[PDB]
Ligand binder design. Structure first.
Ligand SMILES: Nc1ncnc2c1ncn2[C@@H]1O[C@H](COP(=O)(O)OP(=O)(O)O)[C@@H](O)[C@H]1O
Ligand SMILES: Nc1ncnc2c1ncn2[C@@H]1O[C@H](COP(=O)(O)OP(=O)(O)O)[C@@H](O)[C@H]1O
Ligand SMILES: Nc1ncnc2c1ncn2[C@@H]1O[C@H](COP(=O)(O)OP(=O)(O)O)[C@@H](O)[C@H]1O
Ligand code: ALF
Ligand code: ALF
Ligand code: ALF
Ligand SMILES: [Mg+2]
Ligand SMILES: [Mg+2]
Ligand SMILES: [Mg+2]
Ligand SMILES: [Zn+2]
Ligand SMILES: [Zn+2]
Ligand SMILES: [Zn+2]
Ligand SMILES: [Zn+2]
Lengths: 367, 343, 334, 360, 364
DNA sequence: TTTTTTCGATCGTATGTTGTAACTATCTC
DNA sequence: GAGATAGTTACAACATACGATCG
């Protein structure tokens, strides 16, 4: 019913995935009692800037006291969770970018908080404010009243004036890795009582880059496609990703310089109807991974372990020059793909070109 | 109309007071000094009322006309000051000024400030109406050649001793900005009551605040001074000048040089200069340029300039300044291996 | 807006559909300049806005005909660039779209004519899509362009295409000889330079462009032997630079074809110049110069605010450099 | 009055759409399971049915009977949505409403409850044309909309949208329709319209469609208009300028032999006859690809081409594959730059002249 | 609570100000000799002490003992000025109040004599944000100023003001605080606060401050929070690494010395935060071009790259020009081919590998 | 004795002029 | 002394000029 992204917003510092340094710094500051009056949060999309800001607000305004572990059960915590807390003024800077709104906001900063011990202004998308709006906040931000705190969040910090940056403590959130995303997805699905498979979760984690919101959106889409289940076949169909085995077999056939096998593989792919641009992209990715393995033994990731040994074999046999030649040929073929009579025709011509200029076994020369 | 320089303005004022004074130039310091001298003399003569207005499209000329027409019970001998736009007066401003000059009274003293007027601006009804009863003071910032003499004289009139090195440092740091230089001299006098200004003393309380124009950069390129050209380019970038203006200013001289180099194979340079309407003073520098750049050069420069223009126009790139620096080094005798020229 | 004879058939087809009610609400006419597509569109608009049509032609006496003659018909809209500008902005498209919503003043059909769809900016083209897909009842759109491939694919997919084929070469030559007096070779060369479209050759002859072409030919004849291609600057630096660059490219192509051996050449009135070009230049240099000329012409026609003199000077110096031995020549690439 | 085939035959039910099986299955499963998201984005090529599917989803959401994947099509809400005059379905043309002021005004009214339907649906078309400020203003409300509003977005250039917007919505990609599907749809439409047709004309129209059904319908309408109300093979061939005879084979043979005079004569004859140059280039590219394919394996030659086998095999045996690749590259380059040349014939001549130089 | 270091350590005396001798000495001499101008302007970078010096001057002007450069700090006027309750000192935030109507009421108070001070001081800060009408009103007020009023102006963009305003006030330009003075101030503050610290941490913080004392204090507060009440070398180094955003220069340095492991580590670190790969390539190309220009002439490098001046100079001095040209060409080809690569990260990695180990073959 | 610039589309701030609504003072019964 | 009319003040809308950012 409820969207996973909205349902599973962290409500305690223990629920946050990663961002260890920021959480440790905030906890130490709250425990020691050294609390600033201007915090800036930076990072890529969907990493938890707003979540951490709301958790900090809960910690500041909790009824028990200023603590790094909010209870989560008192009236203030519940109201902050529901977004109905009077003393947490949340401003959408993307919508109110005019200096008149900023002046109206600043004209009422000296009034005491209604119920809480602090008045917390959480300005989101602050990078969209106008220059006059930025310059109007300098003095108030530098020397706010005792009972006023400012929290700022943005994804484009470099657009802020240096004067604004000099007045606040900066925390840069980092993109999450595959392991953390996969673990979070496993936990969420287990709590939701939904069947899943390890390979599907690995594919979803790799396809989400380093954003948890993207991972949750992809999980919802897969659940919808899979009809209440997350299956490897359903996720593979949704993402339009072909089996690495077929791409590796095609690369090996191209290297061996046997046209019959390449044509048979192309016919087999056409029987299913494999997307051809995706096939070229997969082959380019495999060649790039082989080159990286040649550069450094540890370049190869864990997700390719199922074929890792095979990859290593190529890294031990193919000279780097041949790898570069194949990569360049496939890149040019992709570049010229749109103007070919047909995508299948273009891919076949690219493969024939690669075979013709094979470093070791070119096609026979006519008499 | 009388023509004068700032030094003779006080002598003219002592001689007598005219009806209208025109202060035209690009130097704020000299304009301010002339305005202050004129207003002090007028106040001595009995002008205790002053009004100032800014000329712009959204201007209330009715108030000015009412001020000119109306009398005063006790506070007579009014003074009016106008500030012309940076671009200069237009047809509407021309007719407004003509109307204002029509309503002129002996008890009203008019002062006008603005940039130097061109021939088209000069040939105006209002300008000619004041010809018989006006004095124009020309306030132009001295060039680098005459700057050290001005600095030495200004220091002398303040009862200060400047060494040659200190004078050179002051000229280098505050070139084209006389207001900053005068304020620096005042601050130095405040710092050292004895008035002894040595090189180490001045070097401590001086900052780089020079002002330049694209013509200075082009002249530096023609002379062949890499350091000066780079400094001018950096100052222009800091100011926020439009790259296209620099591109056009360089293009004119570069095309002229290319044509002269091509056609100088079988023709004396003097005839070419006469035919191309080259100013006499510049003919020197241009000459040495033709003795420093070969035909192989002036083609790579043109190619780089065209590439920079294309990048600025269609690609909307941000690396225009780097290409400008590369071209500046190219015009000076440097290797410039041509990997950056894409040649 | 002359009505050429060869427009008689096509019109008789299009209007016929409008008589049967089987008319597409968006018609895109593909025709070379000087083919008279504007006259055809005007005739169709006059037919559509006539309150009492008779046969395939407007009555000429009803109120609609009088308003069209006076040029103050409320229900007739034209989208053209401003006098000082060169492109059609999005504000005009938005205003026309908002005005189309309300009912017609005369209670009839509404006609909108786009003078040239190739001049539309990206924003205007995107804004026009929604209106063009599902226009209100009794609304007709007419668009004209030279190369449909230059238009936006989404915009193109919403229109019905009609192509005007130039008449046969002999008929065009006879018509031109009837219109103007000139030698047969000159008429044939002018016709071929205009891609076989009559009227464009008439435009070349009626103006002073022929003298400019002769001056360019003389300058090139002087430059080719000596090798001083910079002197051509004066013959090329003009507001009509693209046409002269096209003429130069045509001369180079004719010289290259003559070198390869061919019976037909675009420039039939100047055998000597093409012969000299073929004799004094190698095929590779000719191809490189032709490619550079075409690229510079495209840049001049495409980029906005580009400086003409700098580009032409750079092109001439580059050609002179290419003429030197041992210089690597450009190769076409994606 | 009269409506073209594209407007008349807009699908009104999930079963009336062609292809896009995965999107329909996902939407049906989501509606049945009760898992309904608040932000849907549709991406794909032109004329694939993004707006049609968006309208079908909007109709299904607000149907009086309930939230179902099979709208009745007879209740008041369905009829009003079909007619495009439903109060609670607000359709925005982002191509003409790019101003941030319009976006702010739209967002200021989200607090009002829906008039009649159970949801207030916003259908933003051409959303890629919005300004940056509009996207940033949308972000906050798009993340956490009220419980009674839904957002449907359709675009053809998803790359231009910021990643923040893409992260907040479920994305559905629509594949380009296959030739067989387009041909079947055209045949069904013509049969329903009682219009005579031939299989080859339908095949040619489907091939020229290039994966877009709107383009196929436009071409069919043009053919009907220009063919006295009948679709025939000759009419479609004339409209599309099909090469028919083996002019391309002779031209490529002349090019390979490096005989400039023959190539120029053939080009002049083609220009006199007035053929389409793009079709000629495509046919030459296809012939070169077939020749390259035959060299790898003799059996690769198609059986449908059992009229020029001798010449094709002679070319395959006589020409090394590298020269074939060079010619293919040259023809591709010529095809790319054809619309930018002063004339189509001039561009074709330039391409052929460049190709003639690849001979010792 | 403990307050904030920036707010707690406001300079309350001329002796507490760090550096800026060329301004403080001139002000003290002017006050001693009675040579006081009508309008003062202060310019400089962020967090250099413009407002602090303006407040100190205002306090010195209106002290009970007299006009002196060393305010007593004990009389009622000094305490009121320190607490911000002095009646005759009017502080105007021009950024918040820009319209002419707001400025007119404030400027109309010059017609009233001072209540309990020798001078009526107006301290207008962020004055560059005023509108044209506000500037005209200010100029009209400054044309005929009463003898018992003084104007103090502070801004970071003096070029925005009209020349007429500039010509009627004396301007003082403040300089950067330099590394040594910042380090000494930080050490003094920490010693006063009873906070453990190490020399290396202080040096790193001072170097990262980049000429601003407020930045140094903010970084010190953040480090104290991270270190749990202590300043240590490891904690400060980790904190700076978290905020480090100069991967381009590090990548160039690693590539030039053929160190693949460092290149891969830098790529991973860059990917950890949200960065645009094409932007990274553009930055690397710009750095290489700047190095080439510096090799051509030492004057190419200006004051805009003072932070990384030493590294750029070392790279220019060490690397031969041919290697720089080769790397520049390789990166140009990489940028050209980036759109068609399987992924942006993969494209960048391939280009860096080619620069590290491979050399293109040119025609002929 | 002069030589000074790319264009389109979108967003934000400040000032001047004209029109409408609400409240108060004045006029008439 | 009350109701009606005329005059004054405050707020909103429209039009013009100037400055800044991104493609
Ligand atoms: N560190 C994290 N731990 C747990 N969930 C997270 C984290 N970061 C993001 N999420 C998930 O992503 C969703 C959106 O995060 P959001 O608050 O938008 O972050 P940002 O403000 O950086 O975009 C949340 O509902 C949350 O479930
Ligand atoms: N999947 C489909 N099934 C049936 N008809 C379609 C389909 N896609 C497109 N069409 C036809 O194309 C026309 C335009 O489609 P449209 O809704 O504009 O798609 P898009 O929004 O992708 O351009 C419709 O009138 C319809 O007849
Ligand atoms: N020269 C200095 N000496 C001592 N502290 C300084 C100095 N400059 C700045 N600071 C510190 O920086 C903080 C902010 O300075 P601020 O008054 O904002 O300068 P600015 O007005 O230039 O931004 C002050 O609290 C002060 O402690
Ligand atoms: F809500 Al975000 F990046 F999408 F902070
Ligand atoms: F291609 Al469309 F609406 F016409 F997406
Ligand atoms: F207050 Al400041 F520079 F930030 F003077
Ligand atoms: Mg957020
Ligand atoms: Mg659509
Ligand atoms: Mg300050
Ligand atoms: Zn609590
Ligand atoms: Zn009629
Ligand atoms: Zn229904
Ligand atoms: Zn005191």
């Amino acid at each position: 019913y409820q969207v996973l992204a909205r349902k599973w917003r962290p409500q305690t510092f223990a629920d946050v995935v990663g961002q260890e340094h920021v959480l440790t710094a905030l906890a130490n500051g709250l425990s020691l009692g050294r609390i600033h009056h201007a915090y800036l949060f930076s990072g890529t999309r969907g990493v938890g800037k707003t979540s951490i800001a709301r958790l900090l607000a809960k910690g500041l305004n909790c009824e028990t006291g200023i603590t790094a572990t909010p209870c989560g059960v008192c009236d203030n915590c519940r109201e902050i969770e529901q977004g109905r807390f009077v003393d947490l003024i949340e401003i959408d800077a993307a919508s109110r970018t005019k200096v008149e709104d900023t002046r109206d906001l600043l004209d009422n900063v000296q009034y005491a908080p209604a119920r809480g011990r602090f008045k917390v202004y959480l300005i989101d998308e602050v990078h969209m404010l106008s220059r006059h709006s930025f310059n109007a906040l300098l003095k108030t931000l530098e020397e706010p009243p005792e009972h006023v705190k400012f929290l700022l969040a943005t994804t484009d910090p470099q657009k802020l004036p240096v004067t604004i940056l000099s007045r606040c403590l900066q925390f840069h959130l980092k993109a999450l890795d595959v392991e953390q995303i996969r673990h979070q997805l496993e936990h969420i699905l287990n709590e939701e009582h939904i069947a899943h498979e390890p390979r599907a979760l690995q594919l979803l984690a790799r396809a989400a880059e380093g954003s948890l919101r993207d991972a949750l959106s992809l999980t919802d889409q897969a659940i919808a496609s899979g009809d209440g289940q997350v299956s490897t076949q359903a996720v593979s169909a949704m993402l339009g990703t072909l089996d690495d085995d077929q791409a590796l077999s095609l690369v090996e056939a191209m290297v061996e310089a046997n046209g019959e096998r390449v044509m048979a593989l192309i016919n087999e792919a056409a029987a299913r109807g494999i997307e051809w641009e995706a096939l070229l992209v997969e082959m380019l990715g495999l060649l790039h991974r082989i080159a990286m393995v040649q550069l450094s033994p540890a370049a190869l990731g864990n997700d390719m372990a199922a074929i890792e040994l095979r990859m290593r074999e190529l890294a031990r046999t193919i000279p780097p020059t041949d790898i570069q030649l194949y990569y360049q040929t496939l890149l040019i073929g992709r570049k010229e793909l749109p103007y070919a009579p047909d995508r299948r025709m273009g891919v076949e011509m690219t493969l024939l070109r690669a075979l013709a200029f094979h470093p070791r076994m070119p096609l026979p020369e006519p008499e | 109309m009388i023509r004068l320089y700032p030094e003779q303005l006080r002598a003219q004022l002592n001689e007598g007071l005219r009806a209208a004074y025109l202060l035209l130039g690009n130097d704020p310091l000299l304009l301010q000094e002339s305005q202050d001298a004129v207003r002090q003399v007028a106040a001595a003569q009995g002008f205790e009322e002053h009004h100032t207005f800014s000329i712009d499209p959204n201007t209330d000329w009715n108030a000015i006309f009412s001020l000119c027409q109306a009398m005063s019970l006790f506070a007579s001998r009014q003074t009016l000051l106008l500030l012309l736009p940076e671009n200069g007066p237009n047809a509407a401003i021309n007719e407004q000024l003509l109307t204002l000059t029509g309503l002129l009274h002996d008890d009203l003293l008019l002062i006008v400030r603005g940039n130097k007027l061109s021939k088209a601006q000069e040939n105006a009804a209002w300008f000619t109406a004041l010809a018989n009863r006006s004095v124009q003071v020309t306030c132009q910032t001295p060039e680098q050649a005459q700057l050290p003499r001005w600095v030495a004289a200004r220091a002398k009139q303040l009862n200060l001793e400047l060494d040659d090195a200190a004078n050179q440092v002051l000229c280098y740091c505050y070139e084209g900005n006389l207001l900053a230089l005068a304020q620096a001299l005042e601050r130095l006098s405040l710092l050292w009551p004895d008035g002894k200004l040595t090189l180490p003393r001045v070097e401590q309380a001086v900052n780089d605040a020079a002002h330049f124009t694209p013509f200075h950069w082009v002249d530096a390129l023609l002379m062949g001074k890499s350091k000066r050209a780079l400094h001018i380019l950096q100052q222009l970038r800091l100011e926020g000048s439009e790259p296209v203006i620099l591109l056009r200013t360089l293009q004119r001289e570069l095309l002229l040089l290319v044509n002269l180099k091509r056609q100088s194979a079988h023709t004396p340079l003097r005839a070419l200069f006469d035919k191309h309407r080259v100013w006499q003073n510049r003919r020197g520098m241009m000459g040495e340029a033709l003795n420093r750049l070969s035909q192989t050069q002036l083609r790579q420069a043109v190619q780089l300039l065209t590439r920079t223009e294309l990048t600025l126009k269609q690609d909307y790139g941000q690396s225009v300044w780097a290409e400008l620096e590369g071209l500046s080094l190219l015009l000076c005798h440097k290797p410039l291996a041509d990997v950056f020229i894409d040649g | 807006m002359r009505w050429y004879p060869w427009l008689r058939p096509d019109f008789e087809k299009l209007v016929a559909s409008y008589q049967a009610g089987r008319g597409h609400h968006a018609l895109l006419i593909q025709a070379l300049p000087g083919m008279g597509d504007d006259a055809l569109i005007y005739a169709l608009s006059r037919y559509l806005l006539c309150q009492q049509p008779q046969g395939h032609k407007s009555c000429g006496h009803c109120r609609g005909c009088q308003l069209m003659q006076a040029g103050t018909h409320p229900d007739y809209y034209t989208l053209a660039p401003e006098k000082g500008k060169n492109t059609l902005g999005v504000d005009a498209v938005r205003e026309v779209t908002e005005k189309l919503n309300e009912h017609a003043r005369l209670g009839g059909a509404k006609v909108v004519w786009v003078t040239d769809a190739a001049l539309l900016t990206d924003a205007a083209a995107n804004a026009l899509l929604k209106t063009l897909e599902e226009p209100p009842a009794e609304t007709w759109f007419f668009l004209a362009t030279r190369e449909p491939e230059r238009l936006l694919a989404t915009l193109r997919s919403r229109c019905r295409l009609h192509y005007l084929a130039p008449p046969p070469e002999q008929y065009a030559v006879t018509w031109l000889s009837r219109e103007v007096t000139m030698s047969q070779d000159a008429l044939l060369a002018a016709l071929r330079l205009s891609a076989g479209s009559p009227g464009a050759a008439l435009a070349l002859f009626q103006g002073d462009n022929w003298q400019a072409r002769e001056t360019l030919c003389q300058a090139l004849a002087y430059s080719v032997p000596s090798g001083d291609w910079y002197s051509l600057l004066a013959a090329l630096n003009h507001e009509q630079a693209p046409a002269r660059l096209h003429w130069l490219a045509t001369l180079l192509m004719d010289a290259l074809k003559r070198h390869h051996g061919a019976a037909q050449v675009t420039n039939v009135d100047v055998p000597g110049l093409v012969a000299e070009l073929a004799n004094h230049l190698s095929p590779s240099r000719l191809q490189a110069i032709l490619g550079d000329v075409c690229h510079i012409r495209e840049q001049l026609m495409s980029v906005t605010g580009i400086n003409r003199e700098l580009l032409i000077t750079d092109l001439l110096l580059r050609i002179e450099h290419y003429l030197q031995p041992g210089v690597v020549l450009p190769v076409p690439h994606l």
